[PDB]
Amino acid sequence: MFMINILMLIIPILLAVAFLTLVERKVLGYMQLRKGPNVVGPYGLLQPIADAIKLFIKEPLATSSASMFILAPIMALGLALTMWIPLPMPYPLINMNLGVLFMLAMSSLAVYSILWSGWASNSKYALIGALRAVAQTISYEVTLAIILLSVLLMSGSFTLSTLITTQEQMWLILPAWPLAMMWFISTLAETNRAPFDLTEGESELAGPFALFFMAEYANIIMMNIFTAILFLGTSHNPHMPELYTINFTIKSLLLTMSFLWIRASYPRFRYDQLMHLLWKNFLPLTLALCMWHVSLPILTSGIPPQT
Amino acid sequence: GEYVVAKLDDLINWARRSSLWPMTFGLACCAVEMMHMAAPRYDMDRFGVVFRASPRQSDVMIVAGTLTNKMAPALRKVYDQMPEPRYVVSMGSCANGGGYYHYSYSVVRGCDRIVPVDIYVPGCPPTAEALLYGILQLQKKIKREKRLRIWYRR
Amino acid sequence: TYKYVNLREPSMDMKSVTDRAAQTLLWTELIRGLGMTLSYLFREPATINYPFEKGPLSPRFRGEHALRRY
Amino acid sequence: MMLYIVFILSVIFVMGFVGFSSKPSPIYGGLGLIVSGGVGCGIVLNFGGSFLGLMVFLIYLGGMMVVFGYTTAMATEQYPEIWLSNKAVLGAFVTGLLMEFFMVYYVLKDKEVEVVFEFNGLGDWVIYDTGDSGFFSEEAMGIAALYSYGTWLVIVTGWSLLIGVVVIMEITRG
Amino acid sequence: MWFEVLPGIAVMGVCLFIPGMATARIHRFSNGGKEKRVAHYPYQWYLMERDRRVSGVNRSYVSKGLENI
Amino acid sequence: AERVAAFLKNVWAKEPVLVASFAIAGLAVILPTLSPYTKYSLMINRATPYNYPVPLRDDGNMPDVPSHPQDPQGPSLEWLKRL
Amino acid sequence: MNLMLALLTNFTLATLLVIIAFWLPQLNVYSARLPFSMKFFLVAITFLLFDLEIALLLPLPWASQTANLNTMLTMALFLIILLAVSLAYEWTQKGLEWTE
Numbered sequence: 011m012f013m014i015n016i017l018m019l020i021i022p023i024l025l026a027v028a029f030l031t032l033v034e035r036k037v038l039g040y041m042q043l044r045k046g047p048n049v050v051g052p053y054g055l056l057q058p059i060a061d062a063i064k065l066f067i068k069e070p071l072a073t074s075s076a077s078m079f080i081l082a083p084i085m086a087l088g089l090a091l092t093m094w095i096p097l098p099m100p101y102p103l104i105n106m107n108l109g110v111l112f113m114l115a116m117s118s119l120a121v122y123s124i125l126w127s128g129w130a131s132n133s134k135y136a137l138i139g140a141l142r143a144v145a146q147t148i149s150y151e152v153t154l155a156i157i158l159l160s161v162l163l164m165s166g167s168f169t170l171s172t173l174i175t176t177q178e179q180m181w182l183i184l185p186a187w188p189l190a191m192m193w194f195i196s197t198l199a200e201t202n203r204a205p206f207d208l209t210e211g212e213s214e215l216a217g218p219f220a221l222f223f224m225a226e227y228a229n230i231i232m233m234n235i236f237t238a239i240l241f242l243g244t245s246h247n248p249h250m251p252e253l254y255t256i257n258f259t260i261k262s263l264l265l266t267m268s269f270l271w272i273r274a275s276y277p278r279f280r281y282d283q284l285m286h287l288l289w290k291n292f293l294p295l296t297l298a299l300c301m302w303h304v305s306l307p308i309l310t311s312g313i314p315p316q317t
Numbered sequence: 318g319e320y321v322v323a324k325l326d327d328l329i330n331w332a333r334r335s336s337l338w339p340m341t342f343g344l345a346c347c348a349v350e351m352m353h354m355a356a357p358r359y360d361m362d363r364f365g366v367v368f369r370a371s372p373r374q375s376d377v378m379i380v381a382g383t384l385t386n387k388m389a390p391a392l393r394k395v396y397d398q399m400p401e402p403r404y405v406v407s408m409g410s411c412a413n414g415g416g417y418y419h420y421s422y423s424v425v426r427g428c429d430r431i432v433p434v435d436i437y438v439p440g441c442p443p444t445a446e447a448l449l450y451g452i453l454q455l456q457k458k459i460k461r462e463k464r465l466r467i468w469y470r471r
Numbered sequence: 472t473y474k475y476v477n478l479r480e481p482s483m484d485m486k487s488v489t490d491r492a493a494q495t496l497l498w499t500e501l502i503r504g505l506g507m508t509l510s511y512l513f514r515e516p517a518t519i520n521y522p523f524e525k526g527p528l529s530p531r532f533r534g535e536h537a538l539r540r541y
Numbered sequence: 542m543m544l545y546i547v548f549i550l551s552v553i554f555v556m557g558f559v560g561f562s563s564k565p566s567p568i569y570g571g572l573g574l575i576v577s578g579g580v581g582c583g584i585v586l587n588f589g590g591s592f593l594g595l596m597v598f599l600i601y602l603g604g605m606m607v608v609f610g611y612t613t614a615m616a617t618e619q620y621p622e623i624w625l626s627n628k629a630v631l632g633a634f635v636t637g638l639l640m641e642f643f644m645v646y647y648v649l650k651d652k653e654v655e656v657v658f659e660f661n662g663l664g665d666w667v668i669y670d671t672g673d674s675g676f677f678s679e680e681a682m683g684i685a686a687l688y689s690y691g692t693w694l695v696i697v698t699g700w701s702l703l704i705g706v707v708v709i710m711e712i713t714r715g
Numbered sequence: 716m717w718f719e720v721l722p723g724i725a726v727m728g729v730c731l732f733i734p735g736m737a738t739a740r741i742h743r744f745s746n747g748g749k750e751k752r753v754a755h756y757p758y759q760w761y762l763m764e765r766d767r768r769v770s771g772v773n774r775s776y777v778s779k780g781l782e783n784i
Numbered sequence: 785a786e787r788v789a790a791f792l793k794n795v796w797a798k799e800p801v802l803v804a805s806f807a808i809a810g811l812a813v814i815l816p817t818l819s820p821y822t823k824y825s826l827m828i829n830r831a832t833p834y835n836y837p838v839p840l841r842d843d844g845n846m847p848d849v850p851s852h853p854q855d856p857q858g859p860s861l862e863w864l865k866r867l
Numbered sequence: 868m869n870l871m872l873a874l875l876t877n878f879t880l881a882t883l884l885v886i887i888a889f890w891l892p893q894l895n896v897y898s899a900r901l902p903f904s905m906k907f908f909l910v911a912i913t914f915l916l917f918d919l920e921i922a923l924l925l926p927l928p929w930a931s932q933t934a935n936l937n938t939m940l941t942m943a944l945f946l947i948i949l950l951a952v953s954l955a956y957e958w959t960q961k962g963l964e965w966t967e
């Protein structure tokens with residue numbers, strides 16, 4: 011029974027990633043006064059399938075270390091799917107008492123796939139590009155962890171389903187919209203999304219490729235699902251759980267679509283400029299707001315329950 | 318046997334021609350009409366032809382402009398790094414056969430001296446629509462391929 | 472005759488300074504940019520359905536050559 | 542059997558240690574330490590150390606070991622030497638691997654063993670606590686107490702981290 | 716037109732609806748039609764293990780009421 | 785004072801992010817001591833019964849200790865209900 | 868067991884996808900110091916030291932449940948301020964600059 015449940019999560023995640031590539035292309039297209047894919051299947055609905063087949067029968071074009079060349083994509087894709095197993099939608103696949111910490115711990119491991127693939131590139135210049143990407147990723151891990159802790163001081167625990175209870179009456183975006191703003195931007199920078207897509211930017215100044223792409227786009231969906239739960243909590247009715255799933259899916263779709271919207275709207279940061287955005291802007295505010303959110307429940311007598 | 322090989326060929330052909338990712342060598346003015354083919358009026362993306370792909374993710378090289386002797390080695394190097402199956406589209410008189418500069422000391426008299434060419438698009442420059450006609454002609458060439466049928470008969 | 476593209480002095484009164492502070496912290500001009508791309512999403516695209524539709528040409532168009540008869 | 546899960550994890554723990562302790566290329570040594578770190582978390586998890594186990598992942602693996610690999614790629618090794626191609630590494634790896642197996646064979650055969658010291662072999666489950674029905678995590682209560690009982694621990698720890706920043710900036714300025 | 720973007724969004728939305736809807740219905744099927752019991756703390760695990768013994772069939776989700784008194 | 789206001793306007797114009805950070809951090813340090821509600825945080829935490837309330841052996845000289853949970857003696861949470 | 872099954876499924880599937888991704892029919896018959904930059908090293912080290920302070924703050928949601936709130940709030944703010952002082956020191960010593 012449990013193995014069926016795992017597959018009813020793994021398979022839809024990969025299908026959702028496939029069709030996000032179509033949605034991204036069509037949303038970007040219409041914001042650019044054009045259409046995007048509309049020939050390969052009606053309204054382009056077969057475009058992800060054609061792309062997927064094409065990439066997997068392409069020539070799989072020497073690695074500096076075979077073990078790490080293969081480890082990096084397995085790590086990326088395996089970790090990406092793992093981040094989904096504690097998500098309450100409304101019931102998690104695995105109900106963890108410390109689910110928020112688990113997601114923080116697993117996400118911190120994702121930078122190894124960047125590091126390992128840079129080592130296996132066998133090229134001095136690709137290793138340097140990987141190290142620049144790693145420095146960006148760990149920099150924005152700092153604010154994400156501190157922002158998350160600030161929010162949990164209103165929730166009371168590290169259990170993800172408690173965020174639902176915390177937002178029974180009101181979305182956490184209202185008491186914490188300054189944190190929501192930096193959290194949202196931090197996720198963009200964390201996933202190397204525009205205007206923080208410096209790996210693809212700086213770089214230009216088959217199956218293995220597809221696998222890394224699936225991992226990244228799964229992370230994009232997951233981060234926006236996490237954002238919906240963290241700040242736009244949906245109400246759970248235990249006798250009609252599908253009502254929660256519909257409302258929570260719509261919010262996650264809209265948050266994901268706003269990632270595309272933002273890509274279509276702005277130029278790119280310089281590397282040093284996105285480092286200053288973190289170390290000189292977000293981190294000072296995040297630290298001050300962390301002190302504020304430690305004090306606020308105490309001074310209002312609004313400390314949440316431990317359980 | 319025959320039916321499976323034929324249907325499988327149709328499937329792989331459809332996937333490859335429905336997802337043609339070009340590497341554009343924007344050498345000169347023909348590159349401008351290529352930009353216009355990506356622009357909203359023609360929107361090459363709507364055919365599955367993404368705007369700009371990396372050379373190692375590319376399936377078709379579009380040579381859009383004059384190929385000089387100084388540039389010829391670099392173009393061949395990019396072609397050799399392309400993963401197969403790979404196709405070349407020669408765009409405009411310069412790439413087709415030297416064009417206005419055919420008799421110059423510094424110009425290669427046609428990119429087909431450097432790489433094999435699948436489609437020749439005439440014009441100086443070809444209109445964006447002419448180039449699109451050429452890309453669709455390449456799609457039809459891919460639809461005619463019978464790799465698995467020939468493999469089965471070896 | 473000439474004009475200056477970028478020669479203006481920001482007003483340093485408290486209201487103007489606070490206006491620039493709000494823009495810095497609330498990302499107002501960035502949000503205003505999101506409105507433009509949102510309005511394009513809901514515009515009819517300019518794409519034509521080639522080869523069923525063709526770009527307009529004129530009688531002067533210079534295409535493939537031909538030899539004519541009387 | 543799953544009743545020996547902690548012991549099995551501890552065996553894997555040792556093999557990972559023999560991995561990097563024989564000191565192959567630091568790229569592979571770093572990999573061996575990461576695998577041992579994950580397995581070490583699993584051992585701690587099975588004793589009720591949920592928060593402690595996840596700190597190894599978050600801090601030891603996601604923080605310290607990431608910085609180790611970052612530094613290795615930048616100042617030590619950029620291309621790993623083929624694993625076990627060196628004779629001393631292969632000898633040290635084989636020597637440690639055989640010692641672990643001989644330990645594991647005997648403890649499982651006799652359900653005890655004397656490797657210098659006496660170790661029971663019935664399974665670590667036997668020493669576990671038999672009564673637990675509180676409405677909280679004891680590990681969480683103990684860790685949370687850092688802010689009520691451990692004022693002095695917070696002061697010295699926080700001070701040392703600030704001096705860590707100051708000292709490292711001095712060291713590297715050169 | 717922009718509403719031709721919807722079919723791809725609909726497919727994506729259905730793909731993301733399946734995990735949550737499947738988990739909830741699998742939980743009810745496996746737990747006698749009720750929510751799966753949450754036991755994050757030793758007290759809740761103790762009650763669940765007592766429920767298993769009291770059930771008479773070794774299922775913590777099979778409840779006995781005053782009929783057993 | 786006037787020099788203080790001129791300094792604040794300068795930083796507000798040039799470094800509003802840092803000005804906001806320091807202002808928020810200052811409020812976090814100061815407001816708990818000025819808030820009339822901070823005292824209830826102590827009381828609510830103490831009123832949460834994590835472990836069992838072990839009863840006392842009655843020696844006949846504990847008029848302030850209830851004999852039954854519903855007897856009047858002992859702490860009341862009526863202040864918490866109205867909160 | 869469930870979490871172990873989930874992890875084994877996720878990574879086992881990832882291994883399989885990599886496998887077929889590398890082996891499909893093809894149909895053909897024929898350790899120095901990497902131009903070391905000190906600034907990127909200091910970003911990693913700074914991340915590490917801030918990550919260790921975050922490790923100390925993670926218990927805060929549980930710590931707020933104490934009756935010793937006077938001590939707990941003072942120590943929580945003290946830790947965060949010292950984190951801010953660390954950032955302030957690095958900032959004023961040009962540790963956050965990418966020029967030169």
Ligand SMILES: CCCCCCCCCCCCCCCCCC(=O)OC[C@H](COP(=O)(O)OCCN)OC(=O)CCCCCCCCCCCCCCCCC
Nearest residue numbers: 188190191192194195272291292495496498501801804808
């Ligand atoms: C009564 C007590 C109250 C106590 C609490 C008081 C706190 C509230 C009052 C303070 C408000 C804090 C606002 C926090 C938001 C972060 C602000 C910020 O960091 O912006 C500054 C940053 C850099 O600005 P810059 O112009 O480059 O230069 C300044 C330094 N030289 O600029 C940026 O960050 C730009 C971001 C770049 C990314 C562009 C892409 C994003 C654009 C779309 C964003 C949509 C909004 C996100 C909504 C998320 C919804 C989940």
Ligand SMILES: CCCCCCCCCCCCO[C@@H]1O[C@H](CO)[C@@H](O[C@H]2O[C@H](CO)[C@@H](O)[C@H](O)[C@H]2O)[C@H](O)[C@H]1O
Nearest residue numbers: 062063066067068069070329401402464892893894895
């Ligand atoms: C997602 C599931 C998809 C299932 C689809 C199953 C279809 C199985 C049949 C695949 C046939 C692939 O067809 C073949 O692919 C390889 C990919 O390198 C191409 O490339 C191959 O041939 C060329 C020469 O022709 C070689 O130089 C090259 O090294 C080799 O890779 C071939 O040019 C193409 O003919």
Ligand SMILES: CCCCCCCCCCCCO[C@@H]1O[C@H](CO)[C@@H](O[C@H]2O[C@H](CO)[C@@H](O)[C@H](O)[C@H]2O)[C@H](O)[C@H]1O
Nearest residue numbers: 308813814816817822823826936937940941944945948
């Ligand atoms: C560089 C070092 C920086 C160190 C920074 C330390 C800053 C500390 C600032 C606030 C410290 C005290 O903060 C707050 O003060 C009020 C004073 O009435 C205390 O008092 C309040 O709570 C207590 C409960 O314990 C009640 O009994 C009391 O009636 C109530 O007024 C709070 O318990 C304390 O939480």
Ligand SMILES: N=C(N)NC(=N)NCCc1ccc(I)c(Cl)c1
Nearest residue numbers: 028031034035058061062220223
């Ligand atoms: N960036 C885009 N949105 N477009 C795009 N060309 N994406 C990459 C295409 C792609 C990759 C992997 C898979 I699986 C699929 Cl189905 C499609």
Ligand code: SF4
Nearest residue numbers: 346347409410411442
């Ligand atoms: S063929 Fe004509 S338009 Fe194209 S590059 Fe040559 S001269 Fe320019």
